[PDB]
Amino acid sequence: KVFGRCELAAAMKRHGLDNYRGYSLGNWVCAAKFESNFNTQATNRNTDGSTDYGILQINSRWWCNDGRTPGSRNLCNIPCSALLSSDITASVNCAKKIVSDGNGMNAWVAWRNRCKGTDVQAWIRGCRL
Ligand SMILES: [Br-]
Ligand SMILES: [Br-]
Ligand SMILES: [Br-]
Ligand SMILES: [Br-]
Ligand SMILES: [Br-]
Ligand code: NA
């Protein structure tokens, strides 16, 4: 599924992401835009052999199992394929663990480089929330 901007905002809000660990909704929508272009089916392989999955590009080295990342953990206790569903519940729950592990949303490189310190509220402007 490719989400619309306001559609994703509303889905994230319903799943408790608005102001989760102090990050306003616009941060999460901005990160999803530049990580996956709002596409739940996005995948990207990294040079170390791990793969990033889904709307928030969650990495297989630490967070999910994809059966092909040898030295890896599965901290969200899910198959990586569950992160590609049109239902974002799995991605959101896992993201909540990630953002809580100490480094905040800096775990998402695109957020750091393209959202951090910008007017992120712009990403939910005009939306019915
Ligand atoms: Br957009
Ligand atoms: Br915001
Ligand atoms: Br594995
Ligand atoms: Br959903
Ligand atoms: Br933080
Ligand atoms: Na893994």
From Swiss-Prot:
Location within or outside the cell: Secreted
Keywords, alphabetical: Allergen, Antimicrobial, Bacteriolytic enzyme, Disulfide bond, Glycosidase, Hydrolase, Secreted, Signal
Annotated gene: LYZ
Tissue: In the egg white and polymorphonuclear leukocytes.
Recorded catalytic activity of this chain's protein: Hydrolysis of (1->4)-beta-linkages between N-acetylmuramic acid and N-acetyl-D-glucosamine residues in a peptidoglycan and between N-acetyl-D-glucosamine residues in chitodextrins
Misc remark: Lysozyme C is capable of both hydrolysis and transglycosylation; it also shows a slight esterase activity. It acts rapidly on both peptide-substituted and unsubstituted peptidoglycan, and slowly on chitin oligosaccharides.
All residue ranges annotated as the C-type lysozyme domain in the record: 1-129
SMART domains named in the record: LYZ1
Species name: Gallus gallus
Enzyme Commission no: 3.2.1.17
Name of the protein: Lysozyme C
